Design a protein around this ligand. Sequence first.
Ligand SMILES: CC(=O)N1CCN(c2ccc(Cl)cc2)CC1
Length: 460
Amino acid sequence: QPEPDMITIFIGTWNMGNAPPPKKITSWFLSKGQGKTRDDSADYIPHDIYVIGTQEDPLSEKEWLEILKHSLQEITSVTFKTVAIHTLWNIRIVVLAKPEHENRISHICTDNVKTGIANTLGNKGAVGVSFMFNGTSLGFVNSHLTSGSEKKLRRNQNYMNILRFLALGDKKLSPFNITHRFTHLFWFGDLNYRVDLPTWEAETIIQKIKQQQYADLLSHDQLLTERREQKVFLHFEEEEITFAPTYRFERLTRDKYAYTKQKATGMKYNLPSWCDRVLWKSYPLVHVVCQSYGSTSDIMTSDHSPVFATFEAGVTSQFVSKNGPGTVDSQGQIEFLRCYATLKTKSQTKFYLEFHSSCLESFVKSQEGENEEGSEGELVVKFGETLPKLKPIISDPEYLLDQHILISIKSSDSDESYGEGCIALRLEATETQLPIYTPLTHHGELTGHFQGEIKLQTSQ
Ligand SMILES: CC(=O)N1CCN(c2ccc(Cl)cc2)CC1
C-alpha cells in the first residue's frame, strides 16, 4: 500500500450558542450551504482528517463524540478513529481520522491557553492539537476570542497570547512558537471580528446581505483590515469569503439577523459579522489548496451558522535510508553564502543563528555575525560565508528537496531569539548558488529579514 503524497482535511468551526445541535448536521461535514461548497459527486468520499472546533459547546465530550462519529458514519460508511479531544470551558477541538491512518499518526499533543486577566479571565481562549502524519507535522488551533465590535485590539492581544503560550509540536524547536512548528497550521474558531460600520447602517447591511453583495461589507471586516495593517495573523492565508455573515441570527430560522441592543447583549449592537473563520499557514512551497469555504444554511440551533473549510495538503513519507536516520549521509550538504539578517531592534548585542530541521541530527549554532549599520537606521548582521555546512541525515533528493530549515537569530548576551523564519529546500537547482529569503518574526510580529544564497548538494 503506497504512502499518500496528498491528504484532505476538513476544518469545522461552530459557536453552538450553549444549545444542543439539531438531529442532522451532515450538511456541515459535506461543505453544503453558502460560499465555496464541495461538489455533490464527492459526498461519499471521506476526508482523511476531520478537525471540529466548537465554542459555547454545552455538550459533554462523550455526547459530542457520539454525534460526530455517527454523522460521519452516516455520510461515508466509515467509523472514524478519535485522534484527540481537548476542552477548555466551552471551547472544544475534536480530531477524527480514517482508520487506515491510525499507524501514520504519532506525537499527538493537546494544549489550551486562557486569555484575559481577572475580569477578562474566565471564558475566552484556545484549544489545540498537533501530531505527525508520516513525515508531515500538522497543528490545529480553535480559538474563541474577545466579543464586541469595539474590542478588535483585545482580539489581536488574545491572538498573540495564544501563539506565544500554546505548547504544541516538537518542544526541541524551543525558539519557535506554533507559527513555525508545523508543515501546515490551521487556525479557526469564533475569532469575533466584526463588520465595522455605523449602527444606523444595520438595515442597509441586511439589505446588502439579502442581495449577496458582500464587497462593501468585507471592506469593513475587522479581521481583513487588521491583517492588511499587519496587526494580526501575519503570514496567514484565508480563502475569499463568498457566504453571508454567520452572526448574529435569530435561532430556529436563518431569515433574520438579531442585531439590536438588548440586556442580554450588555446593551451592545451585534451588526451582521463574519465572526467564524478558518485561516492557515503552511511552510513555503508546500502544496495546500482550499477546496471549500462556506457556511451551512440548515443548522439553526445557534445564533451562529457553522463554517466549513476543506484543504488538499501535501504530506511526505517517513523516509529511511542505509545511512540516516541514525547517522549523516556524506553525499548531502546545505551551504549558505553572502547571508545577512536585517533586524528592527534598536539594541546593540552580538547575534548568532540557530538552524533547526528534522533533516539534521540536531540543531546547529553558527559563529556570531558582524553587525553593521544599514543606510536607513537598521541593524544588519553579516554572516558572509562564515555559516556552517549543514549535514543532512539523508541525501536522497526525493527526501531533501521536501525539507525546511527553521532559522532563529539569537542574542549572544541573552540567548533570546530576536526573530524566526523558515527556508524551503524545494530549490530550482542543486549544486547551484540560489537566492533564499524569509521574513523574521518574534511573538508573530515582523522583527526583520534573512536573505542570502543557498547551495544544496544531494546524491543526484
Ligand atoms: C500509546 C497510546 O496510547 N496512544 C494514544 C493515541 N494514539 C492514536 C494514534 C492514532 C490515532 Cl488515529 C488515534 C490514536 C497513539 C498513542
